[PDB]
Amino acid sequence: EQYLGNCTAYSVKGNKVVFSCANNSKIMLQLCSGEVVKIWASADGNFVRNNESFAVIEEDLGWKGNVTVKEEPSTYEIFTEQLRIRVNKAPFQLQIFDKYQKLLFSDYAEKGFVNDNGKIRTNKVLRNDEQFFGLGEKSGNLNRRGSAYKMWNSDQPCYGVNEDPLYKSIPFFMSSYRYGIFFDNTYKTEFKFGSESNDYYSFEAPAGQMVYYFMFGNDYKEIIQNYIALTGKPIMPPKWALGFSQCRGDYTREDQAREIAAEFRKRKIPCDIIYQDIGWTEGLQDFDWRKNNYNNPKGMVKDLSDMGFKMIVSQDPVISQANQQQWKEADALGHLVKDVRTGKSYDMPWPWGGNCGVVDFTKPEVADWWGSYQQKPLNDGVRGFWTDMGEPAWSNEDAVDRLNMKHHLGMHNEIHNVYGFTWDKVVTEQFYKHNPNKRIFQMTRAAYAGLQRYTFGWSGDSGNGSNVLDGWKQMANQIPVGLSAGMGLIPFWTCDISGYCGDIKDYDAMAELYVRWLQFGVFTPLSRAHHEGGNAVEPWKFGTEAENISRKSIELKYKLFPYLYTYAREAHDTGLPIMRALLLEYPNDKETFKLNGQFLVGKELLVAPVVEQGAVTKDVYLPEGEWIDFNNCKTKYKGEQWITVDAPLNTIPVFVKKGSIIPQMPVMQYIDEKKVYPVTFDIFPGNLNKETSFTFYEDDGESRDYERDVFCKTKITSKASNEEIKITVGEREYKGYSPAGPRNFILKIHASNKPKDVFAGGEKLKNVKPHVLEKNIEADFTKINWSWNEAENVISVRIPDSGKNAVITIKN
């Protein structure tokens, strides 16, 4: 095996510096910014790759001028505003320090880069206290330290608590030394975080080029901000995707869709999306409504639309050979992935429907051809897709015959991990082309880094296949799976609520597991109940107790829509997921590295779902600050401690941080049932003289105008003085979108005693009954008054949403 060995010279080309080492080997450092370094180590010195990055869309992160290299007798030095780089000459070693000269990131001994006949590997120093997070949608504990992980998009139904690899390959991790690494290689890469030795960690690939990005940050937020500068801002879903969604394996018929749609509304269980699974299409993959299953598909979609249901249909990336018309069409056009042994279309077995052709989404001409096929259901009013089976399915590591697949852009060993990615990209591209100025809804199984530009994600076929009732630990593991997905830029994520796997032979026995899975599930952004085959898992299937609890779980998400949607926008602007590992907000608190049973939803809410069978309590770590029980709004706790709370079957432990302002909307059966509504702001005043705020974001929810920053915002500010509370409703920041109006705001200030008086600017406000304040809340927009509720300990202040600045002063 070959190392870089000694560095004999360097050459600068603008922001790039190339260090020449032994036997024609070279390594390039490229300054993208003061915080982001692109590193390319080359065994032969050539600096070429078969395909440019599928993930990186921008290498220019603001670096100005040339790289300045200072040469010393035994080292070179490169400085940025944030970094100090020491290159050892003999042998070549790259060391990156922060500006205070603390080592962040070092090559291990002489083994910084190792080439062995195309196998490429990088070894780094591993400090004893160094922890690791990320690598996308993967199982096990949040903290990756001590374990090994592989990138090979795999199809592992009913996967275990530690199963790896899974469906997606996002080779982006973060270190507790406050750097991220994105390994810009699409082959079967492996990450070993002290699993081989305590002295070093490594990442490697069996072929391709050793290109990776070092991303410094002063916290995890800044690392993620740098990652989306490289790989793109997340697209936001249509606003209605943040409601509740329902599916089943057999959701493939008009009659059943009509039946289910009516049942949801009758039982007053909110729901925005009815999915259809893959049996909807006449064959793989013609996008024709299966004729026996749908009498009037246009009418179905419209009828469901008038009831506030949107439809999302499945697509697979293959054409069945038995679908003779489409297979012959695709094969004759050369649109199918080839077999290198024959030069003919690869002959792919598939879970159902016979052998198939794998459609080659790396071939440019395929995009327009697929686009026209997929547009058919969209012309009937279907709003999007779920792109399933794109690993491709049935192509795990051990299925070595798949390696004979030859795609337009390369061989399967290179292309496998971007197969689904390049498909999903075509799906979204074509959607844009045929459906002007509309947000796509796409939720995918298989993916690669950068997927946030084109698609959202779900965690595939989870749960226990042998006995559904044994899936508790598998459900529990969806917390860190989803949090890790979020850190790999899947802010719009869900899991199969109830899991995919396991026949439900006893609904009474399943009720507890379902309820808990859903209580967790409604705090995932794309919350979708689903299950294999005919196993119905709509929220009324588990008896009346489970139905009433589940309705409330779902109602809670809907009430929080204006809060969740604000954080959906933040995902777009910053890359931060809605579901946040506590470490993302409390990076100094090392206790957060262990937390697999809880998470933040945005910054203000801490959710700690019960995920243990029979449990009627929950252990909760509270980080810095003070925390209020969001269910009662009265119990308060000090931060930086473990507590145990009561958590019966009807309860989700949710906590709100003291200081928080939470926008909420009234209960509705689907997003935008009421086109205009009063917005409530639940305010929990922070400590004496500590200012806090929430910036309530709004936009049209449907178009791509938001990408050009067409929106509005209303900042609500809270600041407590000596015996006084100042609540400011900021002047509306108008950027080309006007909110729904006219409407009222109701400021709800949680306080222990009724105040003496409340002022709006200079003038005193009239105190009225709770019933008087609630009167004509949706009809009269001239009343400015306040009321008190002793039971709830809440001051309500009704004020019209005029768009004007307003200072509300509460005299204690």
Side-chain angles (χ1 to χ4, degrees):
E1 60 180 32
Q2 176 208 345
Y3 312 124
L4 285 168
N6 297 344
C7 177
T8 65
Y10 74 94
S11 186
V12 174
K13 187 181 157 177
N15 72 334
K16 301 167 194 53
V17 51
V18 179
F19 294 95
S20 298
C21 303
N23 294 121
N24 310 303
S25 73
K26 299 188 189 303
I27 176 166
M28 184 188 74
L29 316 182
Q30 175 181 317
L31 299 184
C32 300
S33 70
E35 300 189 329
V36 179
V37 190
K38 188 183 177 186
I39 298 166
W40 192 340
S42 175
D44 66 358
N46 285 321
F47 298 116
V48 298
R49 52 195 294 176
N50 191 48
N51 289 280
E52 297 312 303
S53 183
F54 293 93
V56 179
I57 47 73
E58 178 63 85
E59 294 177 24
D60 180 3
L61 276 54
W63 179 260
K64 305 301 176 199
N66 297 325
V67 181
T68 298
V69 178
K70 180 154 180 254
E71 181 172 3
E72 311 285 17
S74 69
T75 59
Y76 303 103
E77 291 161 12
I78 295 162
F79 309 126
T80 77
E81 57 269 37
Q82 306 300 334
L83 301 175
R84 308 273 177 282
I85 299 170
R86 180 180 181 275
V87 177
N88 193 247
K89 285 182 181 175
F92 184 92
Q93 299 183 308
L94 174 62
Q95 300 182 301
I96 310 191
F97 300 78
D98 73 9
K99 80 187 107 222
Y100 312 107
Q101 318 292 168
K102 297 191 277 189
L103 183 65
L104 306 172
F105 183 69
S106 183
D107 287 328
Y108 175 67
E110 83 284 17
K111 291 181 167 49
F113 174 56
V114 182
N115 173 58
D116 180 1
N117 193 33
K119 286 190 190 79
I120 47 163
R121 177 167 166 162
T122 296
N123 301 104
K124 301 282 164 173
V125 163
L126 180 54
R127 253 71 64 80
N128 274 355
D129 66 341
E130 183 156 27
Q131 314 307 316
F132 297 96
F133 315 96
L135 301 190
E137 192 178 70
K138 285 181 180 304
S139 69
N141 294 328
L142 257 205
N143 191 347
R144 310 313 205 201
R145 175 57 187 264
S147 289
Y149 303 89
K150 182 175 284 182
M151 299 303 184
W152 182 262
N153 289 354
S154 298
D155 176 9
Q156 298 280 20
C158 320
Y159 55 91
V161 174
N162 300 281
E163 185 62 62
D164 186 74
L166 297 177
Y167 305 99
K168 306 175 172 65
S169 291
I170 298 160
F172 163 41
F173 71 81
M174 302 191 279
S175 170
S176 61
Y177 277 69
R178 303 201 185 188
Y179 64 93
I181 293 290
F182 169 56
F183 185 19
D184 189 29
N185 187 292
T186 71
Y187 288 85
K188 184 155 67 179
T189 53
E190 304 186 46
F191 296 74
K192 293 165 171 158
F193 298 117
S195 56
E196 280 184 353
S197 165
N198 270 310
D199 301 336
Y200 54 82
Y201 77 86
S202 63
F203 51 93
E204 67 188 278
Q209 293 292 313
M210 180 50 71
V211 189
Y212 63 90
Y213 291 74
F214 174 86
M215 296 166 284
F216 173 81
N218 287 122
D219 61 16
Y220 297 111
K221 296 178 176 181
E222 202 171 31
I223 298 164
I224 289 162
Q225 193 75 67
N226 285 145
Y227 179 74
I228 63 151
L230 292 164
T231 65
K233 291 167 176 182
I235 53 173
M236 288 179 72
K239 61 177 180 296
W240 45 262
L242 299 187
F244 176 73
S245 299
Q246 186 70 52
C247 200
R248 214 194 301 164
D250 71 12
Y251 271 24
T252 62
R253 295 186 65 83
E254 179 179 345
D255 45 27
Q256 194 199 28
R258 293 182 176 283
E259 183 188 352
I260 293 300
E263 282 291 353
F264 270 97
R265 297 290 181 255
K266 184 170 185 165
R267 301 173 171 274
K268 286 169 188 175
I269 298 162
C271 178
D272 278 81
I273 299 172
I274 299 302
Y275 278 73
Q276 302 285 93
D277 213 323
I278 197 57
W280 84 268
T281 192
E282 193 77 70
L284 299 184
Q285 177 63 57
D286 55 23
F287 297 90
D288 297 311
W289 299 97
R290 187 181 281 273
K291 276 197 287 286
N292 291 345
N293 293 27
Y294 302 86
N295 176 59
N296 180 10
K298 282 190 181 285
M300 172 190 64
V301 177
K302 176 55 157 123
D303 288 346
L304 261 64
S305 185
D306 298 345
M307 298 170 74
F309 294 103
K310 279 69 56 165
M311 305 188 79
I312 296 294
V313 309
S314 185
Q315 47 171 109
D316 283 10
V318 308
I319 315 303
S320 297
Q321 284 160 20
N323 181 8
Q324 285 182 250
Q325 199 185 10
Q326 201 182 18
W327 191 93
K328 280 186 46 163
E329 185 198 2
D331 172 70
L333 295 161
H335 288 352
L336 301 176
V337 177
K338 299 199 200 300
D339 190 324
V340 73
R341 295 163 298 185
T342 59
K344 302 175 190 291
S345 296
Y346 183 81
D347 182 12
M348 176 65 190
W350 200 248
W352 67 91
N355 284 213
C356 71
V358 178
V359 174
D360 189 351
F361 299 93
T362 79
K363 190 186 167 188
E365 293 81 9
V366 168
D368 281 349
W369 180 77
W370 194 255
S372 301
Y373 266 103
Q374 83 175 17
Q375 187 57 31
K376 290 189 290 187
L378 306 184
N379 292 334
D380 299 339
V382 163
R383 299 296 299 277
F385 303 106
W386 52 308
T387 42
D388 205 342
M389 314 288 276
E391 296 76 30
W394 270 16
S395 306
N396 293 344
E397 276 201 283
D398 62 317
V400 290
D401 196 71
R402 306 290 171 267
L403 299 175
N404 296 102
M405 274 187 274
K406 173 162 147 75
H407 310 245
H408 179 76
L409 290 184
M411 290 304 288
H412 199 70
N413 68 330
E414 186 187 8
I415 301 301
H416 179 91
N417 288 332
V418 291
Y419 174 82
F421 176 93
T422 53
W423 175 33
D424 295 356
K425 177 174 179 279
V426 159
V427 163
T428 294
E429 279 173 350
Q430 292 288 316
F431 179 92
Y432 291 157
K433 183 194 266 251
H434 290 270
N435 305 271
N437 203 11
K438 283 163 212 141
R439 296 171 198 198
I440 194 168
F441 186 100
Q442 188 192 159
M443 194 175 69
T444 206
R445 199 169 82 170
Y448 185 78
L451 81 164
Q452 71 269 23
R453 303 194 294 278
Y454 312 115
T455 187
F456 320 132
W458 97 102
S459 65
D461 299 344
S462 55
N464 195 282
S466 298
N467 185 346
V468 69
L469 303 174
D470 295 327
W472 282 89
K473 293 184 175 177
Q474 285 158 289
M475 160 182 78
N477 202 54
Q478 293 294 310
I479 296 176
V481 168
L483 298 183
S484 303
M487 289 186 283
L489 270 284
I490 314 186
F492 307 106
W493 184 87
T494 196
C495 66
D496 282 354
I497 299 166
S498 87
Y500 180 76
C501 295
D503 289 326
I504 300 172
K505 287 175 279 190
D506 187 345
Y507 277 89
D508 295 337
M510 186 58 188
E512 191 199 343
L513 181 47
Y514 180 88
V515 166
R516 293 307 197 185
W517 216 315
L518 189 154
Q519 285 174 333
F520 163 59
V522 297
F523 284 103
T524 67
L526 305 182
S527 61
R528 185 185 76 156
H530 180 44
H531 216 87
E532 182 281 336
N535 290 283
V537 293
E538 298 86 20
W540 62 84
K541 295 302 302 187
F542 305 87
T544 295
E545 187 190 28
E547 185 183 359
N548 292 333
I549 296 160
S550 298
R551 185 186 297 101
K552 290 180 196 303
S553 301
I554 292 166
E555 283 176 341
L556 179 53
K557 192 194 193 202
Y558 279 80
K559 280 179 275 156
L560 291 168
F561 172 78
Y563 177 84
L564 294 171
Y565 196 66
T566 294
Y567 282 105
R569 173 67 199 210
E570 219 176 82
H572 171 77
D573 290 326
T574 69
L576 296 171
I578 297 171
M579 301 173 80
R580 296 178 185 188
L582 270 75
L583 68 92
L584 297 175
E585 295 298 327
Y586 300 92
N588 303 318
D589 191 341
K590 297 194 169 299
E591 192 69 3
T592 65
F593 304 165
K594 307 179 195 168
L595 300 179
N596 294 266
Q598 64 176 70
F599 52 97
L600 301 160
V601 175
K603 297 199 296 307
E604 288 79 11
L605 299 178
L606 192 160
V607 177
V610 173
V611 298
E612 269 186 39
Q613 187 169 26
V616 301
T617 60
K618 178 71 179 187
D619 293 356
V620 181
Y621 181 73
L622 300 174
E624 173 282 320
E626 303 183 72
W627 294 89
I628 296 154
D629 181 328
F630 194 64
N631 299 128
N632 73 25
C633 300
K634 214 170 68 163
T635 315
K636 197 166 98 263
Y637 305 86
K638 301 299 191 195
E640 308 198 311
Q641 53 159 346
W642 283 95
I643 62 173
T644 298
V645 298
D646 288 314
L649 186 55
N650 72 357
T651 303
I652 319 181
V654 182
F655 304 86
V656 60
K657 194 167 186 178
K658 185 178 177 193
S660 299
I661 309 184
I662 307 300
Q664 285 178 281
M665 76 175 194
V667 165
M668 303 176 194
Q669 301 312 118
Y670 55 95
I671 301 299
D672 250 42
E673 186 182 29
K674 290 174 168 295
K675 232 75 178 293
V676 193
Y677 48 89
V679 178
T680 286
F681 298 94
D682 270 284
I683 298 154
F684 302 88
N687 289 335
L688 193 55
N689 309 312
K690 183 158 179 160
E691 194 170 74
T692 63
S693 73
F694 194 91
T695 299
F696 172 35
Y697 172 90
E698 296 178 277
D699 71 15
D700 76 29
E702 306 293 330
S703 83
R704 303 185 65 190
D705 294 359
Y706 80 96
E707 298 196 56
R708 299 177 298 97
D709 300 343
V710 176
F711 56 72
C712 71
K713 295 181 175 170
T714 312
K715 188 174 157 183
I716 315 294
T717 305
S718 179
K719 193 186 164 62
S721 323
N722 277 323
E723 59 177 36
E724 172 174 305
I725 312 287
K726 195 153 283 191
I727 307 301
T728 303
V729 181
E731 187 189 23
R732 187 185 300 155
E733 188 187 331
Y734 177 72
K735 302 299 219 304
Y737 171 84
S738 299
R743 76 187 170 187
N744 291 125
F745 288 164
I746 307 168
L747 310 167
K748 286 176 79 185
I749 306 96
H750 295 253
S752 56
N753 300 300
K754 182 173 178 168
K756 199 201 182 200
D757 292 303
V758 178
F759 296 89
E763 299 193 345
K764 179 169 287 191
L765 294 181
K766 189 173 185 293
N767 180 22
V768 303
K769 278 257 211 303
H771 188 93
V772 171
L773 184 142
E774 292 152 12
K775 200 156 188 284
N776 303 131
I777 196 66
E778 304 205 55
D780 185 359
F781 315 103
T782 64
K783 316 310 286 293
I784 319 189
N785 54 52
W786 75 278
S787 72
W788 170 256
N789 188 315
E790 188 69 46
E792 289 173 24
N793 276 17
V794 168
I795 304 155
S796 293
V797 178
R798 166 177 181 166
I799 187 171
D801 176 27
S802 70
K804 307 298 180 195
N805 198 259
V807 179
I808 305 305
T809 308
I810 301 166
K811 303 292 187 181
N812 298 348

